[PDB]
From Swiss-Prot:
It comes from Daboia russelii. SUPFAM superfamilies: Phospholipase A2, PLA2. Monomer. The lineage of its organism: Eukaryota, Metazoa, Chordata, Craniata, Vertebrata. This is Basic phospholipase A2 VRV-PL-VIIIa. It is found in: Secreted. It catalyses: a 1,2-diacyl-sn-glycero-3-phosphocholine + H2O = a 1-acyl-sn-glycero-3-phosphocholine + a fatty acid + H(+). CDD domains: PLA2c.
Length: 121
């Protein structure tokens, strides 16, 4: 769930989940539409897509167990859905870190109205 996703995002990137990634570009937080702004907005595009492969669970709400360990992130014996959600998030959190440089405060709190168009997963 978001409570787990947020801890992850903080743990890996050092930045707090909320202002730092909850409205970034066109796909972080909101989702919806548009051509992703940059590397970090693109992660969100994949993460959405990641949650999309699952219509059988509640990504935003179902709580899962994961632990850290000298660096990497480990998801644990859950309920398929629970496990699947964790790898989705795990990836996404890794992607943010992977691209912590292209992080631009210019896109932090990027509205919506300027986000235009289709994009198939
Ligand atoms: C409308 N809703 C949908 C309705 C029917 C099928 C798929 C979707 C969503 C789910 C998910 C994703 C982006 C980001 C956002 O989290 N959601 C929106 C747009 C779409 C997009 O795939
Ligand atoms: C992919 O990054 C996010 C960040 C915030 C939210 C949200 O606030 O719903 C969803 C996905």
């Amino acid at each position: 769930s978001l409570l787990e996703f947020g801890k992850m995002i903080l743990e890996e990137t050092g930045k707090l989940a909320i202002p730092s990634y909850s409205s970034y570009g066109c796909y972080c937080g909101w989702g919806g539409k548009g051509t992703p702004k940059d590397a970090t907005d693109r992660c969100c595009f994949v993460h959405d897509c990641c949650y999309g492969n699952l219509p059988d669970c509640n990504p935003k709400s179902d709580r899962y167990k994961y632990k850290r360990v000298n660096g990497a992130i480990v998801c644990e014996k859950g309920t398929s859905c629970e496990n699947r959600i964790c790898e989705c998030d795990k990836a996404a959190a890794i992607c943010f870190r992977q691209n912590l440089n292209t992080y631009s405060k210019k896109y932090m709190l990027y509205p919506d109205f300027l986000c235009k168009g289709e994009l198939k997963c």
